[PDB]
Design a protein around this ligand. Sequence first.
Ligand SMILES: NC(=O)c1ccc[n+]([C@@H]2O[C@H](COP(=O)([O-])OP(=O)(O)OC[C@H]3O[C@@H](n4cnc5c(N)ncnc54)[C@H](OP(=O)(O)O)[C@@H]3O)[C@@H](O)[C@H]2O)c1
Ligand SMILES: O=C(O)Cn1ccc(=O)n(Cc2nc3cc(Cl)ccc3s2)c1=O
Length: 315
Amino acid sequence: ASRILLNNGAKMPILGLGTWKSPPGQVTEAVKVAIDVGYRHIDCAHVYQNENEVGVAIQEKLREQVVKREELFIVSKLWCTYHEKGLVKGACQKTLSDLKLDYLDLYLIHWPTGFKPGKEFFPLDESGNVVPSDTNILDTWAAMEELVDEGLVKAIGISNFNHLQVEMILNKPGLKYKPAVNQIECHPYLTQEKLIQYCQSKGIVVTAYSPLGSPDRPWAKPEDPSLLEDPRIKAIAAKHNKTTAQVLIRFPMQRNLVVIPKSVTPERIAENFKVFDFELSSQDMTTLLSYNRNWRVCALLRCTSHKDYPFHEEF
Ligand SMILES: NC(=O)c1ccc[n+]([C@@H]2O[C@H](COP(=O)([O-])OP(=O)(O)OC[C@H]3O[C@@H](n4cnc5c(N)ncnc54)[C@H](OP(=O)(O)O)[C@@H]3O)[C@@H](O)[C@H]2O)c1
Ligand SMILES: O=C(O)Cn1ccc(=O)n(Cc2nc3cc(Cl)ccc3s2)c1=O
């Protein structure tokens, strides 16, 4: 089945295209190729500073009659320097303008942390610590709720929230919309069993990011583990005459997750979508879950002092 039901009654494609680190010089072609081979879900963010080039591609394929807007599922995220309630609408509208759209299918609070407002996406002090803003999760959520009530987004959710931060929102007095999705890092070295268990039990769909372990992450160190190069996983893939990446994409799919692998290479974009023609066995799944090391690609330690830093909690 290719789509999962959200709590807003809409259906979200379980396989989408990641765009973090896709250069503007290449992401337009990436998206065009993706849509041509079947992707309908694109994961975006204002902080990725390529939304205009993503919008170029969508506009194009709409104009070529390859797809209709209704068939697309476009995701973006509210960046940390816009968590003040008076800044959320503007941030959302900038993303809409850049993507040349009239609505987003899903809009996420990108991180639970608010940062000092300003042009700087990661404001630091003279010391190198990120400068927080005096905003909180609940007020920011209320602001996200207005975007639904105004017709700008069909659904709202969160990203990189721990189960206690998700809880705050759920128990929010006067809650208007429950979160639809929590997008979190998830892959065989960070299997997220507990948080997935919590979210799915609350009827919140989980999206797995960095499913290939983000080898292009700019802070990679050579000693870091490498999922795509893991011989144990290469062996699972060779058993199914599939590539390591296809295995890494198919894994979260069989855990009822959404997954959003990133590529700007047309061959790999196609390859990565060809994961609906095979099944990981029960042993394969068990084996892959067993590689958990609680290893995070995305956890900027310059944020570990923010009151809302998400990863001090077990989950
Ligand atoms: N919510 C947030 O905080 C958050 C954080 C991180 C990521 N995300 C989202 O999740 C998406 C995916 O995560 P990610 O970008 O960190 O990394 P990823 O998808 O785990 O890995 C992308 C890397 O894998 C390479 N690659 C892709 N397909 C491959 C294949 N078949 N064989 C070999 N290498 C392949 C890509 O190369 P090329 O592109 O050069 O082909 C790129 O270097 C993002 O782009 C973003 O949309 C969200
Ligand atoms: O955010 C994106 O989708 C991609 N991305 C880009 C740059 C980067 O450093 N990170 C790591 C971060 N860690 C935290 C940790 C916290 Cl608490 C807040 C924000 C971030 S950003 C990152 O994930």
